[PDB]
Amino acid sequence: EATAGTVTVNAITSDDTIDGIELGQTISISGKAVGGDISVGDVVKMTINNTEYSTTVKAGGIWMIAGVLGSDLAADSEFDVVVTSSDAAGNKVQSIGTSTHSVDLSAEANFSLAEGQQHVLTNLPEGFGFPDGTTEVVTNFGGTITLGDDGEYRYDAPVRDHGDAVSDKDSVTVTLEDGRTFTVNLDIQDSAPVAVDDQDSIVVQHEEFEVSEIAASWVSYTHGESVTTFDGTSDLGGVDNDSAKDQIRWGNPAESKQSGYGFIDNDSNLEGRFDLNQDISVGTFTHYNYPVYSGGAITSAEMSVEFSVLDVSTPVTLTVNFDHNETPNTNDVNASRDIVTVQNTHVTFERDGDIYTVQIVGFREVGNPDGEVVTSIYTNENAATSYELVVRVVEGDGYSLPSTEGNIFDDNGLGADSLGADGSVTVVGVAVGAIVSSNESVGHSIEGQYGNLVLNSDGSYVYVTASVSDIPAGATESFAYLIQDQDGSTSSANLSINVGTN
């Protein structure tokens, strides 16, 4: 027998795969044919997609077919190569090798594109297009890739919930009649709202009223033993400039003196003037807490605070009611404290047909004009506490404080918040100052520097509690708010309120 040799086929292109670009090209095939009785010049034959290609063995045992159609190789992924040789005596032999290759006519095109917008698709793979007549393909998510009359492909990116359990990477595969496919992968990017800063303003009115001296009188009480009312003395209450009865005392003393209240007006400091929208101390209220036999104390007492307002004087009387709790005394010093609660009463008066209201604010620690105002005070047995009795004069019926409203989604000087493509935008956080996160203050009253804000989830707000004396020129409130869209994207902005006085 003649001796068969070894016939090998090199990779069909470098990656041993015919792809969509190679599909339209002419491909060189090559291999080796060595050993046995294979001789330079021997015939090499192969059938690929039913076309026979032939060549001869070259020096080095090499063989090459100059040009096979890529379409033939795409149609036929396996073929034998047959070399015909002879030995010296003329015996003939066929040496056979087998070639396989892969066919992958696909190509991918990958994009990352904002939801809710149309996008021109750039840098598409070479040869990309639609089958003839097709001008639109629908993507997996119901978006579209449209071929325009300008030759460009545009993707209409659907809005997605980027917070849920469903991938937001869209895709579509275009199949062409020659076998090519183009897979366009479209990673849809989330959008977000843009909160824009808001400006609002409010002006608190100023007014100076001329007032007479004050005359405070205990005028009535309920319960109590040995109850007396009297104008204060050096020994009981301190002295004041009028004969009105500023002191009240009660109880059968169980140790030394009687419990009671005293009120020393602020006539000297006031200098016959009240101001509008301004916490004013009308006097110093002292609670004298002594031990008295249980059962002998008042439960309430009423004090008339009388003064005149200059227009013609119009007398005004503010009735101040105090609830009194002379608590049974134990060995707990705190539980044995006696408790005074002042009621939130007011009086309305008229000056020049313009009406105003004096309202009780409460008790403020003496000397601390910036201190907290409280309506209940606590005094140890065998002690006296003193507090300024603070009122405020407001315009009208005193039903509300100076206020302004708005909505932070409106254009408030710098444009309206942008809601993004997801929508379902609500306010999820609000805070005084520069920093805000989703929090529990939306729809709740929160305290600023000069007043209180209620900002609701739909952006609506109502905002001044400060006294005029505490509002400097150029005073500004700043509240940070946070808006959030359907799938959690957030944006913050500041609501700035100019607080002026007039």
């Binding site: 109880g251 169980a254 140790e255 031990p291 008295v292 036999y293 249980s294 059962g295 002998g296 104390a297 002379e326 608590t327 049974p328 005394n329 006696d338 047995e381």
Partner: peptide, 4 residues
Amino acid sequence: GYTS
């Protein structure tokens, strides 16, 4: 309990 007695005094208050």
